[PDB]
């Protein structure tokens, strides 16, 4: 199957694959807030173009697109866009999340007139919409190609409001599941401070876990990750139902994703607070949602002062970046993803194949130290070769632009340059 | 299988432009990524840019931005490369080639020569080379090529036309020599027929 | 930016093994591809992804890449292997293809043949045009050195019988062609001379 | 006889045989809702061709066809259509089921203007029709070749509505039986929650079996599998009679099939809820219908998170795929079929020959991660050689493909001599 | 007892098209599955597509895309392969072949050599090779293009002692070949010998008496 | 797209056993069929279903298939078994036939054979056409390598000559041809022309004269 030994050598040779897609840089335009999803030989992609500042510039265009991932005969995956939609008020669309089912990608987004709902939570009126796009659109054949739906029925249980929160979800049967987050008033949050793991942490106080379940210690809301379920069999009015994540290894609600690998679902949750080691695992149950988190000791993420990479003591912290990983071998629990090789700055993307306690092999994605942020990795088989596609949000030196780049990385089946007659003997 | 057929050779003055074509047959035109690569004399290959017609937005290295324009026409399944402000140092063979594996090229076009010169088109002067073998000196023409036949094709044995030479004036010269029996000088007429189709000049010289 | 370094020339005899190199800083981390180009022809892919062979390419072409050196090794070299061999990578930093300088491979498939020199004086008709050109025609020989300085000499070509031919001309004034009483061209191949007197 | 020892995959080498049939696959077209039946050297086949999406495309054509299965001289079974019929308005034809009798295949279908009756059950008005097709048609023969009948008398007992529900049925004498399902109002369905096996199932509740007898816990109907009986001796306008399946190992009504093997009837019911292990067995009685289900521990079906492959704890779920198997040896109870080798996705079709508790030999029909859905397997003798034909929905779009697999009569000559002695 | 017989060799300009036929005899034409396979000089066998007349919908590999069109005529018990947009690399022998066991090919047609070229066809000139135990006489089949040519003697009656030599390619781009027969010197006076030359690409047949 | 890999060539001595291999990922799970093609004619099925022989095929031909390599083994190899051998599978994933690249079977070390040379002058008809051809036919030699040189009177003739590669005859010996093209004036201007054929250090010669 795959190379399962640690290898210091050069068995990973990533390739750039965005040149076939309409991601076209222009001086003075920043390309931000990207999403990538890959399922069943199709993909979904989104970004926001801003004129000027990536955070304060003029929203120019929100791209929401779908397409095909093809083997054109050269035994590599190539990406071609088939269907693009742009909303007329791009500044109001936030936190899109894409899930594939049969003919379509369904993309669930938040609609907001007060900016990012995470930063303006009390002032955001809950408003969700869905854009449905055919992956292979057809002439005449109305309503099929593109369909916009405002969601009117949301079942949110005890949460004051809910929102998609992560790049991509899964289908099971005819039910869609999007990574999501629920906003619960801090006063209603039940948490026992004695369970906060401070045992061998000299400067951590028992209140630290509960305080860092919102974006600051005095936030009106705490954030809880979960799923938004959309059963397509029901028909008629769309009903989204929120499913909260169980409280084993609970961290602040954060961008997440759920995906199928080798026939079962898997979950990644970004580490946006004091528990900085990577959070991913097989999903035990989807509803209620419970994840069997790996005890991973080698993959972390960069932070800032209080919660830097490899920090494990509870602190009051809202820091980190989304850098997911994709399970490629369940028997040996081996995963592939891009991590940022830096302690307190978002820098230096490295593609790595790793187990719980050891990185097997890895390659830097840039030739010198480079600012990079969110990374999203999805893997699949081409015939019987494991390929991964990784989106990397990056500062691009060539044209002096912030933009997503897409790499394709073939996972080696053989560990070694040669067979090695010493170890095997005659 | 994809195959790539380019347009023919071109001779251009400095400061003009030239538009080279690359006809793509087979494959799927919108999804082929056609690159351009030039080969200057005594120098390696140099990447110039590419286009994928489904995107229809070319890209170039910073060297060639502003001087190279690449476009695609799905109605003719042709990719074009236009190089403006031509210089002497743009003299080269230009290839198109199809991207494979996100990394290599296969196949290539047959290449298009682009010669850039200040010279004006000029028919040659033909001077007989008297024996003491005999030949014809085809002197001071531009551009290549000339064709030399003897007795209007009736003598194809013993004739060697040497490749031309390019002098500092920018004009070419070449020679065509025929070895004949020492006795044949008396009763056989030897005529070299020179044709310079670029200048539409034909010369017939009895030697 | 990124640079590939190739040796300009290598010579091997038929049946032997030719090894072409392509150097680059940590080239072993990139995928290296190889093309064969014969004079007047389009390049042909002979090795891709360091070590893989396209359909139709014989098993004698082999490729390796490690460290700072990639190699194309041709086993049991035929005469038909004579060509320029270029290595190539894609530089992810600049997002551009990079090519090596190319390595000219020569197969010594024939015995050493020495030239045949033919020197022609300026024609009478040419002198009446106030010009003089002495023509120095070298045939049936792989390269030579011509010696006569308003000189124009060609690069050697290959004939219909796989031999070398070349020319060299001498532009002189008619008063200069008449000034002296002898002119000669020596051709040096591994010399041979001719003379014409006004 | 057949190889009865565990053996490597290379003993089975399936071949594609649908190239002789008008399963005309092309881009922009999807061929969906298939059935296959094989009987006495003939076969029935059906599909729905749509232009565009398998799901949302314009219905172009529903074919219902019959033909013969023959050895052309190369010692393999080849399928050729002999007689094809296309109903008007193909979007209205659902859940066809085909049964062979003497000169004909009889195909029973539901007529619907509200989509799939299963997911629109309180809106579907029961309406059924039958097309009879001669397998060896003859010129100028009246209605011998093709004969259409719309049913208008159905005896359904306490059920509100009944419907064909499975690819093929059986004859017994001159009475035909089609796999079927009855819609019973949930308020009229009685089930003792003590019959729900929740021991060693911490998360299961005793109510779960009764709630999962409909497609959701509050559904208006529960669904009960059974047969629709069509007795040719009564004559005239057909009266169909619904026969409900007995309540031993009762699971939600689901697509099923009944077939003859080695002289006796066998039943398969798809596992569409929490009991995910394969349900098949010899038929004890046809009316009342009672199946002696195998206690099979090795073949299951992919599900979703609540009822994944190999689950045996009661849950409220409607999940699963139809992947049948065909008994090929009653003495040792060996069957052959295609299962989906995946836990919570419909992927990786594998042709397998299996006993209750052991897969003897098996082979993947495609690559790892190939999407695949419904599978329908029928086996028969061609001269003295056992062959199986499997229709597999398989995945540029999912399409029915037909595979043919020769079943080995022995494992190897040395194994045969070792075990048999003499 | 099925037999597959193909049409004769052809030459075509690049950019044009060619249509090869395979005449099926001795089986149930509707149920035979006829495949096409080609073989270029110095290369192996390449599958091109198939058709079954009762289904009458061909399948092709994606290497050929829109270039290949395969049809069937129950009128004639004939399957046709047409290849559009001809390129120099399409020069090959084209074979039809009958699908068996849903997996292999038996039997095969005799093959059709299709040459694509800029030069149009040219039939041969035929000159007698007059003779002198045994004597040797023959026929010179000169300056034809392209391959192939067939030579028979006395319309096929004589095949003992007949050596037909493979062709030479010459400067012109034209071929020449010779066919000779070794024969008792005694019968030279009374036995007649005629070479029958056939060049399908140019649609030329020649009979020449040699003496 | 499945890929089969065969060696380009295999050579044996007469009477030996020849082994042609055909490699592929788990090829032993596929049915493997073998075709024998000679340079002129259509392929002939020699093995099907890994290891079965069609009617009329010698038992000397037998195949096997297991693991990652299938093989055709030819016992008591005959010089008439010289051919290109192609393995073939049907790839169920793409639903198309796949052929190996083919393995050319050369039977090395056959009995030596000296060439028979026959030379013909230009015919009267050809001379009337204003052309002249000398035809030198070389037959029945082994090995298949000859060098031919033309002599006019004494001098060698390098122009106008065109010579074939040797090709095997049906009797497993080789044949070749060489054509000297002259003008009718050249043919009459010399006293004699000669075709000289050297094979394995010996020389056969024929001469014609106008
Ligand atoms: C947050 O909401 C308040 C209340 O409407 C508004 O004044 C403020 O501008 C919002 N912030 C952003 C960044 O839109
Ligand atoms: C809180 O946690 C502590 C330690 O885990 C435990 O002793 C206590 O029972 C828990 N609950 C309450 C209500 O204190
Ligand atoms: C991680 O370790 C804990 C014990 O600290 C264990 O309960 C859990 O099962 C482990 N996770 C795995 C094995 O995925
Ligand atoms: C990052 O932090 C780790 C752990 O505190 C430390 O060992 C290392 O030196 C730091 N710098 C790196 C890994 O470049
Ligand atoms: C049920 O039928 C109605 C029309 O009566 C249709 O609009 C709806 O889509 C159907 N629902 C399903 C699940 O097919
Ligand atoms: C989706 O709705 C259908 C219709 O009620 C139901 O049968 C199915 O169980 C539902 N799926 C989930 C995952 O709840
Ligand atoms: C079919 O009907 C006939 C006539 O009423 C009856 O004799 C026979 O027993 C019936 N068969 C079955 C299986 O009910
Ligand atoms: C399966 O086991 C049950 C008891 O749990 C038994 O009644 C039934 O007969 C068994 N099935 C078979 C085929 O033996
Ligand atoms: C499928 O589920 C079974 C039963 O829980 C488990 O043993 C097996 O590991 C699963 N397979 C995969 C590929 O997850």
TrEMBL record, chain A:
Cysteine pairs bridged by disulfides in the record: 30-54, 96-109, 307-317, 379-388
Gene Ontology cellular-component annotations: host cell plasma membrane; viral envelope; virion membrane
Sorted UniProt keywords: Disulfide bond, Glycoprotein, Hemagglutinin, Host cell membrane, Host membrane, Host-virus interaction, Membrane, Signal-anchor, Transmembrane, Transmembrane helix, Viral attachment to host cell, Viral envelope protein, Virion, Virus entry into host cell
Membrane topology field: Single-pass type II membrane protein
GO biological process terms on file: symbiont entry into host cell; virion attachment to host cell
Main location: host cell
Subcellular location: Host cell membrane; Virion membrane
Gene Ontology molecular functions: exo-alpha-sialidase activity; host cell surface receptor binding
Protein family membership: Belongs to the paramyxoviruses hemagglutinin-neuraminidase family.
Protein name, as recorded: Glycoprotein
Included range, full protein: 187 to 604 of 604
């Amino acid at each position: 199957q795959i190379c399962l030994q640690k290898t210091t050598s050069t068995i990973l040779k990533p390739r750039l694959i965005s040149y076939t897609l309409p991601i076209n840089t222009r001086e003075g335009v920043c390309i931000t807030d990207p999403l990538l999803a890959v399922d069943n030989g199709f993909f979904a992609y989104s970004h926001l173009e801003k004129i000027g500042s990536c955070t304060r510039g003029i929203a120019k265009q929100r791209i929401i697109g779908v397409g095909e991932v093809l083997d054109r005969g050269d035994k590599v995956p190539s990406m071609f866009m088939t269907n693009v939609w742009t909303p007329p008020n791009p500044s109001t669309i936030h936190h899109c999340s894409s899930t594939y089912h049969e003919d379509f990608y369904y993309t669930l987004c938040a609609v907001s007139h007060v900016g990012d709902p995470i930063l303006n939570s009390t002032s955001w009126t809950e408003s969700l919409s869905l854009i449905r796009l055919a992956v292979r659109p057809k002439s005449d054949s109305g309503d099929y190609n593109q369909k916009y739906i405002a969601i009117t029925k949301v079942e949110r249980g005890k949460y004051d409001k809910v929102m998609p929160y992560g790049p991509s979800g899964i289908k099971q049967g005819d039910t869609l599941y999007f990574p999501a987050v629920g906003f619960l008033p801090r006063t209603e949050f039940q948490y026992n401070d004695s369970n906060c793991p401070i045992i061998h942490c000299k400067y951590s106080k028992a209140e630290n876990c509960r305080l860092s379940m919102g974006v600051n210690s005095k936030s009106h809301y705490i954030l809880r990750s979960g799923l938004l379920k959309y059963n397509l069999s029901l028909g008629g009015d769309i009903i989204l139902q929120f499913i909260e994540i169980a409280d084993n290894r609970l961290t602040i609600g954060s961008p997440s994703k759920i995906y199928n690998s080798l026939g079962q679902p898997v979950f990644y949750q970004a580490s946006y607070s004091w528990d900085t080691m990577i959070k991913l695992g097989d999903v035990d149950t989807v509803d209620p949602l419970r994840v069997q988190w790996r005890n991973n000791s080698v993959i972390s993420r960069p932070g800032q002062s209080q919660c830097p990479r490899f920090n494990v003591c509870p602190e009051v912290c809202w820091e980190g970046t989304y850098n997911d990983a994709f399970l490629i071998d369940r028997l040996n629990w081996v995963s592939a993803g891009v991590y940022l090789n830096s302690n307190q700055t978002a820098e230096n993307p490295v593609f790595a194949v790793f187990k719980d306690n050891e990185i097997l092999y890895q390659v830097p994605l840039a030739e010198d130290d480079t600012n990079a942020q969110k990374t999203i990795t999805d893997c699949f088989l081409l015939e019987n070769v494991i390929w991964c596609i990784s989106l990397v949000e990056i500062y691009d030196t060539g044209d002096s632009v912030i933009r997503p780049k897409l790499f394709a990385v073939k996972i080696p089946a053989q560990c070694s340059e040669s067979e090695n007659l010493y170890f095997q003997g005659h | 299988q994809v195959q790539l057929v380019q347009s023919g050779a071109e001779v251009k003055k400095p400061g003009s432009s030239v538009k080279v074509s690359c006809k793509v047959s087979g494959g799927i035109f919108n999804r082929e990524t056609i690159n351009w690569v030039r080969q200057a004399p005594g120098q390696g290959l140099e990447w110039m840019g590419r286009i994928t017609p489904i995107v229809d937005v070319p890209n170039y290295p910073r060297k060639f931005r502003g001087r190279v324009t690449i476009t695609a026409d799905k109605s003719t399944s042709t990719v074009y490369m236009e190089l403006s402000g031509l210089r002497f140092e743009d003299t080269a063979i230009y290839f198109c080639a199809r991207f494979r594996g996100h990394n290599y090229f296969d196949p290539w076009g047959q290449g298009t020569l682009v010669t850039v010169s200040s010279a004006s088109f000029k028919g040659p002067s033909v001077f007989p080379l008297a024996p003491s073998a005999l030949g014809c000196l085809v002197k001071d023409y531009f551009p290549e090529p000339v064709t030399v036949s003897w007795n209007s094709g009736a003598l194809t044995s013993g004739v060697h036309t040497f490749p031309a030479v390019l002098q500092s004036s920018g004009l070419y010269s070449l020679s065509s020599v025929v070895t004949v029996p020492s006795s044949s000088l008396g009763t056989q007429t030897y005529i070299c027929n020179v044709n310079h189709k670029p200048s539409n000049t034909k010369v017939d010289k009895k030697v | 930016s990124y640079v590939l370094t190739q040796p300009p020339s290598v010579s091997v005899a038929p049946g032997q093994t030719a090894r072409i190199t392509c150097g680059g800083n940590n080239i072993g981390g990139k995928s290296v591809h190889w093309y064969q180009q014969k004079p007047g022809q389009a390049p042909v892919l002979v090795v891709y992804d360091d070590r893989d062979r396209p359909s139709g390419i014989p098993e004698r072409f082999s490729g390796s890449n490690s460290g700072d050196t990639a190699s194309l090794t041709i086993s049991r070299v035929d005469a038909g292997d004579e060509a320029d061999y270029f290595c190539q990578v894609w530089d992810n930093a600049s997002d551009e293809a990079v090519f090596g300088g190319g390595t000219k491979l020569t197969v010594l498939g024939q015995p050493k043949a020495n030239p045949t020199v033919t020197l022609f004086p300026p024609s009478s008709e040419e002198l009446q045009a106030n010009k003089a050109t002495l023509v120095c025609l070298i045939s049936d020989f792989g390269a030579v050195t011509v010696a006569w300085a308003g000189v124009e000499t060609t690069k050697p070509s290959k004939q219909s019988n796989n031999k070398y031919a070349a020319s060299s001309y001498l532009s002189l004034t008619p008063e200069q062609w008449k000034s002296h009483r002898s002119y000669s061209c020596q051709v040096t191949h591994e010399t041979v001379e001719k003379t014409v007197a006004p």
